[PDB]
């Protein structure tokens, strides 16, 4: 939780929570880790405006706070994140490797 | 530095009528010489600078929560045509 981070759009687990049921992290800041797991919001029973239906009450409430979420999940769930061994000419690949592994290859899924 | 442009039309109401038949009013770089008006005028809108006058105004009365202010400096200048040409679209407009 700093100028540096955890997972990004990613897809991860909820340990100390109410859901645990991991899923799509719609957006995650740089400093306040502020990340939305699309896993628990509300309605803000909207303005009474025609902003929302003239008869409103916003629906998708999803600002995800706490940072006990168990980011990253290869064939393994709760795991920290490795770093590199480069291996290839100019190779950062700070992919995530521990027990199972996941790096969010630019392919099949984030 | 030398980017000729130096203005923002006088979207102002009262100023309208003039636009309407022969003169036109605008906001101009608080500073341009009146002859500056004549030149920006002339080469800018391909016209015939006639009667170039000037006025200025700063802001008064803007309360800001716990502190306050009243705005910056808005400059006014009016120039007239020779035949009634140019500014067309602008004028039909507002």
């Amino acid at each position: 939780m700093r100028v540096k981070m955890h997972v990004k759009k990613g897809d991860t687990v909820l340990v100390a929570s109410g859901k645990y049921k991991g899923r799509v992290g719609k957006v995650k800041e740089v400093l306040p880790k502020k990340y939305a797991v699309i896993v628990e919001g509300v309605n803000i029973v909207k303005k009474a405006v025609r902003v929302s239906p003239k008869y409103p009450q916003g629906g998708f409430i999803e600002k995800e706070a706490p940072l006990h979420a168990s980011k990253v999940r290869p064939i393994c769930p709760a795991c920290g994140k490795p770093t590199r061994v480069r291996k290839k000419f100019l190779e950062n690949g700070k992919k995530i490797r521990v027990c199972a592994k996941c790096g969010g290859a630019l392919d099949t899924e984030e | 530095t030398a980017y000729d442009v130096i203005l923002a039309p006088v979207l102002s109401e009262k100023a309208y009528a003039g636009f309407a038949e022969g003169k036109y009013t605008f906001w101009v770089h608080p500073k341009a010489t009146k002859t500056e008006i004549k030149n920006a005028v002339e080469t800018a809108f391909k016209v015939k600078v006639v009667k170039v006058n000037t006025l200025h105004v700063r802001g008064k009365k803007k309360r800001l929560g716990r502190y306050l202010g009243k705005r910056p400096d808005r400059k006014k200048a009016i120039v007239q045509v020779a035949p009634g040409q140019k500014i067309e679209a602008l004028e039909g407009l507002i």
Partner: protein, 67 residues
């Protein structure tokens, strides 16, 4: 428009001259716009300014190289 960075690289005296001048006029166009299209304009304004800015950065670079 890093590409524009390129064109930049490309032109020289009277060129960059009237380029930035005309472009500038363009942004004027914007100034005018201050109450019409507007919405998608935004960018014409901010970026266009940044662009012409570059124009100048260059002129400086080149003729500076000169004298």
């Amino acid at each position: 428009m890093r590409k524009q960075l390129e064109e930049a690289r490309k032109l020289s005296p009277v060129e960059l001259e009237k380029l930035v001048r005309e472009k500038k006029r363009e942004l004027m166009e914007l100034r005018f716009q201050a109450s019409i299209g507007q919405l998608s304009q935004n960018h014409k304004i901010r970026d266009l300014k940044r662009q012409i800015a570059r124009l100048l950065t260059v002129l400086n670079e080149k003729r500076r190289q000169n004298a």
